[PDB]
Design brief:
The structure is cut from a larger assembly and holds one copy of chain A (51 residues), one copy of chain B (426 residues), one copy of chain C (51 residues) and two copies of chain D. With 51 residues, chain A is mainly α. Chain A is built from three helices and no strands. With 51 residues, chain C is an all-alpha fold. The longest helix of chain C has 14 residues, at 23-36. The radius of gyration of chain C is 14 Å and the shape is flat. With 427 residues, chain D is of the alpha/beta class. In chain D, the strands form three sheets. Chain D has a six-stranded parallel sheet with strand order 5-4-1-6-7-8, with helices on both faces. A four-stranded mixed sheet of chain D has the order 9-12-10-11, sandwiched between helices. The chains are: A mainly alpha (51), B alpha/beta (426), C mainly alpha (51), D alpha/beta (427). The interface between B and D is large, with 37 and 34 residues. Bound molecules: guanosine-5'-triphosphate (2 copies), guanosine-5'-diphosphate and magnesium ion (2 copies). Residues 9-11, 14-15, 60-61, 88-91, 130, 132-136, 161, 169-170, 196, 214, 217-218 of chain D line the site of one guanosine-5'-triphosphate.
Chain lengths: 51, 426, 51, 427, 436
């Protein structure tokens, strides 16, 4: 039963779990821990409308 | 006006001619039902050369199909532009030769050639002033070679003054379909050197290598080869069909390319041939056409022209262009590789220009080269013929039909004398 | 001579998707075939071999 | 264009019993005779809605014949197309050639005469017989004689079943095979040998049918015949008719003997397994593991070859494969024939029979070649013929039936002449 | 005026993948290669001409050849967005990689790929009419870009020779490294790059990493951003040919004005202002600060210190809104400053250049379109310090005969190792001799 269930595949490759989107929480992670996605600039809170 | 009578023999001839009448019908813009559907009036003025009006714009071709198997006729009527041929021009036996020059030249001809002679006579006197005849056939098969060469001989005896073009495919050892291809080839070429006016040598080896390297098709079926041959034949006859700045008829090509009555074996090339994946790399300029024309990889015969000398050559240009660039380009390619041309004839290159490119094209050119490197191919055939005739392999199916071995000796002699005189002029 | 110039390849043939030997040109043929709607095999010889 | 086929003996009509099953299945003809122009070369369309074959089955024992008459194909075959004698020839060439032939052969030929009269564009005859027996050998040779007298110039494609070297079912089959060859030489225009040990090894090795009967043999032999008449039957890119084997493969009037081959002989599982391409089947059609005659062409030299292709085959790759064959040197050709190949292509793929052991293949190759290993065959058969003839064994059967020592001597020295012939041409 | 550009190796063609993206954006050409249909180019489009050769109607093919031995990255170009721009015949691709092996890349596979590259570059030069010179792209650390690249430079020098060859190579960083045997491959590369090319510009990687970290405020840059600003450097170099400025210099000027000695040709490059969108808003951009900015090590492309060296010559290309009065004033301020020192060999150690057209960047982001920018190409002795740094770590591995068996298994011998080692020592002696 166990090697037919094959739990190791599920733990090593978590296909059931959703992938890494974290649409809005990525913003708060960048704000708190300064951890951006690779190809991104640091984004200030400039009101570009005022200028 | 000036009239071309098309004649097709054998399986090869029947299929390549089907594609030929397809592309000519395309260039004159006539539908597969037989009515004109083009745009300009420039096409209507020279349809008499290839078609005849029957009723209500029904332009039917001036062609004669000839074979021995109905399978060729089924393949004729199956495809489009298979319904526009006159059913009376579907002359066809029933028995079949099948790789036998004897059967193709002594028995099956004996009761087929008379009926085709009646129809080609009716076809010839239906028009006023012939330019000549244009025959496409094979040399490996029986019903094409034997029946074709017998017709060629008989029609040249009756009409000795009219021109004659023959597009004959010759066999190569690397693309070697039949077994008695030498026995049929040697006997046919021995008939051609005495009866045909000039011969355009073709072969499947060059065509396959062209479709691999220059077109880069993965499955080069016969229809593509037939269309490339069709492109050549249409390019040949462009000048009678359309006006230009300097027209050149077939007789004008024959006199500019035949210095001696037995030196009439050409090698042929056509441009442009580029893979449609690279159709935007290349522009359309006369030097771009010339580099592809004079290349050895673009000849339609398995003969390296750099292994010999060009005796003469001719280039037929289609489309609006500049004559200065044409002439100085031919002069430059003549002076640069000066050793590959003969010395006792200056200005070996004849040129011509018509102002209408083929449909879908902007500017094209067709190449006819009378080189002395054609003797390599006939030597490539003669050595096989000697190997067979040494101890008479396959000989009885010929000798037991009405042929003698003296036909084989004289064909051997004529071929050896031809390759000797080509080597002499080298 | 001039037209031999090569040795026939002892190799298997994939489709146009795998990048083996002639996938580029075959891909262009197949693309225009999909553009018109008909298959690659069914094509007029001129459409397949002239400009 | 039509061709009529004749089947002689106990083997002949069992091969026909499988062959005509294939034809019905390829042209979609129900076993009761009606469809639910390509068929017109085999099935004449009598009346309205009924096709009835251009064939004759014949034998001297009525057992296997009326087994046909009561099989699945009762309504398909004309009642009198199947001819049946009263009593067997019983493994005796003289009995099948002089006593019983004199009364069956005349009914056979004035029967095929009106078969030929209903026919219009006859290619020729193709025959199916075995030489180990008496009915196939004796009146098969007697019929072939009177065929050559009547028509002659029409081709005679002969698919004959020679005795295998080791595997054997009879005892006097050397005598009968020799006496039949003595007439098979100057009567059949071209002949294809078919042994049984070679096909048994094929079904054992490739198809992996461990215990095969005759029906498997008959089925794939029918597949061969269909693969070399497919050119007449259907339209191909390059079709070659029946008169081609006459020309492209018979260099001398007494050298007409051809080894046949077929590829791919593959079951239902190895099909999904293997990527069928023209290169490997053109290669596999040359190793003796796929020849229908137990001999080794390594010891011989090829004279001519012919290659039928069926299905999705373009001339490009067949040309490339034969180029690789000509450039290889494991096999060798005679020097007195450089262009040793003929091709032929037809479009329709070979169909499968329900319950058969061959799979639906995209493309197939039927190779028919000439060699000198057949000269090795006749020598190996002549050796064991002399073994029995030195002691004059079994001779009293033939002499009491009507023959004498002369026919034994002359057929012996004729095979000697054929031996000298093959060894002279091969070098 | 036409210049053809060849790309050898994994690094070179990715730089080109960014470089041609920049060019087509500068001349406003869509990825397919046709011009924008709505906007009319006009009859005299001479500017496009140096790189793109007009063929037929409305199609521009670049005078470039990507070539490499592993097919992966090349066919990614063949299947990417620029499928229609290059068609198949210029993108030369091998069958298997050189695998960080100079010998394998120069002798095993080079013998069959270089001839095909050469009679293609012949046809490209035949299509050309006013050939100014070549410019090559390669990273000397790899196998293909080092081995076959040097083989290509040699056979080009025997074909034409007199024409200038701008070599934009990528050297391995001292501490930042991705390969192991790149000391061997770099040394063997310079063995030919010393006497074959004319003008060879060095581009390190860690210096660019420091630039994207500090000025571009990209905390983790990928190769894309590196290749993007390198394409900015190249475009700013050839903008004098592509466009008409107030003071133009062509490609033969670096040949005369920057290389005082036939073997001392290695140029440090720098660019300014490398700046984001926010910093540009907060910073007033003028010529004096960027003329300064072009000389601090915080804006150089090679990780070295010009403080420890003395300048041989400097060249300054200006793009955008630049008048000659204040650039003359800034270089006056520089020549009167004493934080940097020139050699006593050349009193006039500058070469200015002004072009009207401003820098252009990908519209997506990472770089604010500025009014003016500068690209500096100088010559000093810190480059000699770099070579000595690589020579030491080459000698360390060679002393134990490490990794030598792969090369001699390919077919090379200890002779070229020893003679390249002493050749680099000769280069060190030459730098120390001229610097004094
Ligand atoms: N491969 C194969 N061989 C067969 C088949 N039927 C008979 N044979 C062979 O025929 C050979 C002898 O001839 P038979 O068919 O038995 O009988 P016959 O030729 O009609 O001669 P008679 O017995 O006198 O009627 C035997 O060696 C069998 O191997 C068959 O269906 N397939
Ligand atoms: N600037 C930049 N450098 C790169 C890039 N890709 C690779 N490199 C450099 O190239 C060096 C190694 O050579 P590569 O170009 O990767 O590989 P190669 O030169 O083709 O040699 P082979 O892998 O053997 O074919 C590495 O040390 C990198 O620093 C890139 O995209 N941008
Ligand atoms: N290019 C081309 N060659 C063909 C075609 N059909 C047949 N052939 C060639 O013709 C040769 C055989 O000629 P064959 O058909 O026997 O001539 P026939 O029997 O007299 O009609 C072979 O070598 C084929 O390559 C075709 O459609 N195109
Ligand atoms: Mg029996
Ligand atoms: Mg690499």
């Amino acid at each position: 039963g166990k090697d037919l269930s094959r739990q190791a595949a599920a733990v090593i490759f978590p296909t059931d779990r959703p992938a890494e989107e974290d649409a809005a929480t990525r913003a708060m992670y960048t704000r708190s821990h300064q951890d951006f996605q690779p190809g991104e600039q640091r984004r200030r809170d400039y009101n570009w409308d005022a200028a | 006006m000036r009239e071309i009578v098309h004649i097709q023999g054998g399986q090869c001839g029947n299929q390549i001619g089907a594609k030929f009448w397809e592309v000519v019908s395309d260039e004159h813009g006539i539908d597969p039902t037989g009515t004109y559907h083009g745009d300009s009036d420039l096409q209507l003025e020279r349809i008499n050369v290839y078609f005849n009006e029957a009723t209500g714009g029904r332009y039917v071709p001036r062609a004669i199909l000839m074979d021995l198997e109905p399978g060729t006729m089924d393949s004729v009527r199956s495809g489009p532009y298979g319904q526009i041929f006159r059913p009376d021009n579907f002359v066809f036996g029933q028995t079949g030769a099948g790789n036998n020059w004897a059967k193709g030249h002594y028995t099956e001809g004996a009761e087929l050639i008379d009926s085709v002679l009646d129809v080609v006579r009716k076809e010839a006197e239906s028009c006023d002033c012939l330019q000549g005849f244009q025959v496409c056939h094979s040399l490996g098969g029986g019903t094409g070679s034997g029946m074709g060469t017998l017709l060629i001989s008989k029609i040249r005896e009756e009409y000795p003054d009219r021109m004659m073009l023959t597009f004959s495919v010759v066999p190569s050892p690397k693309v070697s379909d039949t077994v008695v291809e030498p026995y049929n080839a040697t006997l046919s070429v021995h008939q051609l050197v005495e009866n045909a006016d000039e011969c355009m040598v073709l072969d499947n080896e060059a065509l396959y290598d062209i479709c691999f390297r220059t077109l880069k098709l993965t499955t080069p079926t016969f229809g593509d080869l037939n269309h490339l041959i069709s492109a050549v034949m249409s390019g040949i006859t462009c000048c009678l069909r359309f006006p230009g700045q300097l027209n050149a008829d077939l007789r004008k090509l024959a006199v500019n390319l035949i210095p001696f009555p037995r030196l009439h074996f050409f090698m042929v090339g056509f441009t442009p041939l580029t893979s449609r994946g690279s159709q935007q790399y290349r522009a359309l300029t006369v030097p771009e056409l010339t580099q592809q024309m004079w290349d050895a990889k673009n000849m339609m015969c398995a003969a390296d022209p750099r292994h010999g000398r060009y005796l003469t050559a001719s280039a037929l240009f289609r489309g609006r262009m500049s004559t200065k660039e044409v002439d100085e380009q031919m002069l430059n390619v003549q002076n640069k590789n000066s050793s590959y041309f003969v010395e006792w004839i200056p200005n070996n290159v004849k040129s011509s220009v018509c102002d209408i490119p083929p449909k879908g094209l902007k500017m094209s050119a067709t190449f006819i080269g009378n080189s002395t490197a054609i003797q390599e191919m006939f030597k490539r055939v003669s050595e096989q013929f000697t190997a067979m005739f040494r101890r008479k392999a396959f000989l009885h199916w010929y000798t037991g039909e009405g042929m003698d071995e003296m036909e084989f000796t004289e064909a051997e002699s004529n071929m050896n004398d031809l390759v000797s005189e080509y080597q002499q002029y080298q | 001579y001039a037209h031999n110039d090569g040795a026939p390849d002892i190799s298997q043939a994939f489709q146009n998707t795998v990048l083996v030997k002639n996938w580029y040109e075959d891909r262009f043929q197949s693309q225009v075939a999909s553009a018109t709607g008909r298959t690659l095999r069914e094509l007029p010889t001129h459409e397949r071999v002239v400009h | 264009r039509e061709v009529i086929s004749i089947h002689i003996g106990q083997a002949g009509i069992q091969v026909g019993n499988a062959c005509w099953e294939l034809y019905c299945l390829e042209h979609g003809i129900q076993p009761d005779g009606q469809m639910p122009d390509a068929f017109n070369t085999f099935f004449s369309e009598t009346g309205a809605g009924k096709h009835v074959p251009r064939c004759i089955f014949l034998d001297l024992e009525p057992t296997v014949v009326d087994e046909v008459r009561t099989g699945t194909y009762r309504q398909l075959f004309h009642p009198e197309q199947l001819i049946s004698g009263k009593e067997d020839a019983a493994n005796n060439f003289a009995r099948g050639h002089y006593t019983i032939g004199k009364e069956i052969v005349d009914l056979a030929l004035d029967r095929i005469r009106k078969l030929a009269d209903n026919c219009t564009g006859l290619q020729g005859f193709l025959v199916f017989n075995a030489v180990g027996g008496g009915t196939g050998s004796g009146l098969g040779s007697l019929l072939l004689e009177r065929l050559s007298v009547d028509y002659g110039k029409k081709s005679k494609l002969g698919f004959t079943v020679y005795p295998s070297p080791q595997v054997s079912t009879a005892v006097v089959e050397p005598y009968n095979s020799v006496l039949s060859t003595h007439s098979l030489l100057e009567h059949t225009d071209v002949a294809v040998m078919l042994d049984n040990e070679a096909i048994y090894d094929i079904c054992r090795r490739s198809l992996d049918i461990e215990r095969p009967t005759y029906t498997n043999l008959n089925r794939l032999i029918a597949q061969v015949i269909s693969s070399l008449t497919a050119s007449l039957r259907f339209d191909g890119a390059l079709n070659v008719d029946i008169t081609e084997f006459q020309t492209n493969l018979v260099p001398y009037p007494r050298i007409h003997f051809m080894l046949s081959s077929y590829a791919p002989i593959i079951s239902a599982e190895k099909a999904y397994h293997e990527q069928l391409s023209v290169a490997e089947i053109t290669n596999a059609a040359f190793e003796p593991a796929s020849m229908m005659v137990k001999c080794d062409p390594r010891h011989g030299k090829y004279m001519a070859c012919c290659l039928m292709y069926r299905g999705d085959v373009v001339p490009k790759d067949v040309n490339a494969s034969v180029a690789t064959i000509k450039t290889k040197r494991t096999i060798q050709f005679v020097d007195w024939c450089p262009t040793g190949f003929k091709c032929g292509i037809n479009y329709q793929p070979p169909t499968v029979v329900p319950g058969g052991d061959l799979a639906k293949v995209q493309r197939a190759v039927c190779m028919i070649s000439n060699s000198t290993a057949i000269g090795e065959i006749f020598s190996r058969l002549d050796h064991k013929f002399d073994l029995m003839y030195a002691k004059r064994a079994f001779v009293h059967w033939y002499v009491g039936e009507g023959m004498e020592e002369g026919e034994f001597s002359e057929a012996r020295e004729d095979l000697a002449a054929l031996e000298k012939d093959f060894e002279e041409v091969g070098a």
